[PDB]
């Protein structure tokens, strides 16, 4: 997988590595799930999320 295509399958940030290697990353206030692509909030108010809407669907 490559970052330029489909975001390397990453939910957020993507880094290409030497080989057929790829690493996904997450913004501060998020952690990467074991799927190696998904980001989950680690704080109450992570960036780029709308609380009243997150709640609205919680």
């Amino acid at each position: 997988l490559i970052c330029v295509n489909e975001n390397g399958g990453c939910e957020q940030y993507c880094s290409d590595h030497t080989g057929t290697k790829r690493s996904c990353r997450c913004h501060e206030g998020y952690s990467l799930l074991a799927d190696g692509v998904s980001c989950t909030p680690t704080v109450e108010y992570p960036c780029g999320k709308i609380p009243i809407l997150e709640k609205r669907n919680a």
Partner: protein, 249 residues
């Protein structure tokens, strides 16, 4: 904002209102608890740098509902390459005197990685622009925070479809050419926010150039060009004196 709608209270929680001597100056975007991104041009005519205020959790300007948080602006950082009264490099980084407290009504927008922004975000068609700007060309400003969905254009297409400042690599076009929908005076410095896989990111800043002018598109500062510049600054110690010109790149 022309041809938009009211942003429901709390649905635009990263939106900042900038005031000078209690008067509406510009918009901004919260990216962290102490950092706000705006437009350089907003500060062109600033006399007393010490009377700058940033308001978070604002919605309806006519009332106080207690969700509002006001902070003094401790620092205004502008790139070296910005020339007052012009359009290129129309960006500013503002340091608040004290952090805002994150709440349901006060949340930062994610400042993305450059690569991510360039490779992915830049290809998301539609993004949201917001502010308390003019509701009409030569019209009154909004009392309630407004928001507008606008499509982004490749610069080549922008130029073609348009019919006077250049569109530089530090800019992009977004909106409509039919004069129905645009960001306007009073909106400058505000966010152009892009959704991707359940999260919102800062891709643009409402710059300037009239508004909702037929044959013309809205122009936005291309935030991706500035990520590294911003990041470096955010890691830096404050300096005496509000205004700081910092080298770019």
């Amino acid at each position: 904002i022309v041809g938009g709608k009211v942003c429901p209270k709390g649905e635009c929680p990263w939106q900042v209102l900038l005031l000078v001597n209690g008067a509406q100056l510009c918009g901004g975007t919260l990216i962290n608890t102490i950092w706000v991104v705006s437009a350089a041009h907003c500060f062109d005519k600033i006399k007393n740098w010490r009377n700058l205020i940033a308001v978070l959790g604002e919605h309806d300007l006519s009332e106080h509902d207690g969700d509002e948080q006001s902070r003094r602006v401790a620092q205004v950082i502008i790139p070296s390459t910005y020339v007052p009264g012009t359009t290129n490099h129309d960006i500013a980084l503002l340091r608040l005197h004290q952090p805002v407290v994150l709440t349901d009504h006060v949340v930062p927008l994610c400042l993305p990685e450059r690569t991510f922004s360039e490779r992915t975000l830049a290809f998301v068609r539609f993004s949201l622009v917001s502010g308390w700007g003019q509701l009409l060309d030569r019209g009154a400003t909004a009392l309630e925070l407004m928001v507008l969905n606008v499509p982004r254009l490749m610069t080549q297409d922008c130029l073609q479809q348009s019919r006077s400042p250049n569109i530089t690599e530090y800019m992009f076009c977004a909106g409509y050419s039919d004069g129905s929908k645009d960001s306007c005076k009073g909106d400058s410095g505000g966010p152009h926010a892009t959704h991707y896989r359940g999260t919102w990111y800062l891709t643009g800043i409402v710059s300037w150039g009239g508004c909702a002018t037929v044959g013309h598109f809205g122009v936005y500062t291309r935030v991706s060009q500035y990520i590294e510049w911003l990041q470096k600054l955010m890691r830096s110690e404050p300096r005496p004196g509000v205004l700081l010109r910092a080298p770019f790149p």
